[PDB]
Design a protein around this ligand. Structure first.
Ligand code: CDL
Ligand code: LMN
Ligand code: 3PE
Ligand code: 3PE
Lengths: 179, 92
């Protein structure tokens, strides 16, 4: 099925990556600026960037691995919870509560929309029209995704929809027959 | 006879040194003078590898025309230039 994540290992890897990103961004901020600056103001007039790159990188993947472990599956919801944690880190820079709540809701919704589609900026090679079976089916095959048939099996639609509303395992007229 | 062995790694070290003297110089002519030094270290490497013809083409057009072109421009033009000070370049 799946495999649980090392929360501490992935978190400390991302902590090192966030450290390196903070260092290269502070090095970029020194040189792309004006006025009197030297070697020591790398972390003095840094704008607080290394805290951003560190805290987001820890909180996202820690919340992601923790949510994927306690739910015991992998889908787009884990990216929602992890993006909510990232919005909590990015919302605390502006020390105001309704700002903070808005960052947590909206960045979490944007990261959940990213995670639900496949959590990829690129495409999946397989499982898309050019590289997947499409069109009609040829015989009594299990209708996969991307495919069309003319009549679904009733035992499949009763499993999917339910046994309630109007849908029944026998159509209503031959259920009421004279013998 | 194995004094005559390290000849390539020598010119590699000399090219490192020569670009350090390109980008750290006072006058704008001192930089192009180390640049024609860099072209001739290159042409020595190109003879060294087994290409005697190219080295002389590099002398003909790279310490040939475009050298004279740059020396010429730096003569008949004024160009302000600061020095490599620590207070303006340690931030990089
Ligand atoms: C449907 C549309 C959905 C999207 C837009 C909806 C609008 C939301 C409101 C935005 C807003 O008002 O901000 C103002 C705010 C400017 O502050 P201001 O104008 O001084 O504040 C005065 C206001 O009146 C604010 O003062 P106030 O007291 O009226 O309100 C307090 C607070 C309240 O916040 C709100 O107004 C929204 C609250 C919603 C609550 C909903 C409850 C019911 C559900 O205001 C905020 O600070 C909102 C910040 C929310 C930021 C959301 C960023 C999401 C980026 C999505 C990109 C895609 O904008 C910013 O904070 C800067 C944003 C710059 C862009 C940041 C981009 C970061 C992207 C990170 C990655 C995201 C995921 C990317 C993909 C992931 C995979 C790679
Ligand atoms: C109009 C606005 C609405 C926005 C909707 C966008 C979201 C749409 C996403 C749904 C969809 C794209 C389909 C899109 C087509 C139309 C798109 C329309 C407009 C697009 C804007 C992406 O499906 C993604 O869903 C994610 C979560 O649900 C998963 O997250 C990730 O999970 C972890 C790894 O799995 C990651 O480790 C984790 O990191 C991620 O979290 C991804 O695995 C998954 O690829 C589904 O595609 C796929 O569906 C499956 C069946 O499921 C099909 O395979 C089937 O297998 C059998 C099963 O019967 C049958 O043989 C048969 O049935 C079929 O062979 C595929 O062929 C394939 O095609
Ligand atoms: C092991 C090593 C671990 C570390 C490895 C990670 C390396 C990641 C490096 C990221 C560095 C951040 C880039 C950067 O330096 O941005 C600063 C620069 C200018 O920003 P600044 O002047 O400070 O602020 C002005 C704001 N108005 O901003 C820039 O203009 C730089 C241009 C952006 C950098 C290009 C990145 C391409 C990807 C963009 C992300 C888009 C994602 C789309 C989703
Ligand atoms: C305004 C118009 C612009 C749109 C704005 C939308 C902003 C984004 C809202 C948040 C969307 C992100 C939700 C993450 C959903 C993660 C996920 O995996 O959904 C799972 C579920 C299908 O998952 P499945 O693998 O088939 O297994 C369970 C089936 N019951 O599928 C679902 O739960 C349904 C998810 C879509 C719900 C609709 C949300 C509004 C669109």
């Amino acid at each position: 099925h799946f495999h649980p994540y090392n929360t501490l290992g992935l978190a400390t890897q991302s902590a090192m990556v966030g450290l390196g990103a903070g260092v290269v961004a502070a090095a970029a901020r020194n040189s792309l600026a004006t006025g009197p600056r030297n070697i020591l103001t790398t972390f003095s007039k840094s704008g607080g960037v290394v805290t951003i790159f560190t805290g987001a990188s820890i909180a996202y993947v820690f919340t992601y691995c923790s949510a994927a472990n306690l739910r015991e599956r992998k889908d787009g919801w884990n990216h929602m919870w992890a993006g909510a944690a990232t919005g909590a880190v990015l919302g605390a820079r502006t020390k105001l509560v309704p700002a903070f709540i808005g960052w947590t809701v909206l960045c979490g919704a944007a990261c959940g929309l990213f995670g639900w589609t496949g959590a990829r900026f690129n495409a999946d090679r397989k499982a898309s029209l050019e590289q997947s079976p499409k069109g009609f089916v040829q015989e009594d095959a299990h209708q996969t995704f991307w495919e069309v048939v003319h009549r679904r099996p009733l035992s499949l639609t009763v499993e999917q929809l339910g046994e309630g509303r109007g849908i029944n395992a026998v159509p209503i007229a031959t259920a009421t027959e004279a013998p | 006879m194995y004094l005559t062995y390290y000849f390539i790694e020598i010119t590699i070290f000399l090219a490192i040194l020569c670009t350090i003297f390109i980008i750290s110089a006072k006058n704008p002519m001192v930089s192009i003078l180390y640049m024609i030094a860099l072209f001739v270290i290159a042409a020595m490497y190109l003879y060294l590898i087994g290409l005697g013809i190219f080295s002389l083409l590099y002398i003909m057009i790279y310490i040939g025309a475009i050298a004279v072109l740059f020396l010429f421009i730096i003569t008949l033009l004024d160009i302000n230039s600061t020095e490599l000070s620590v207070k303006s370049n340690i931030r990089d």
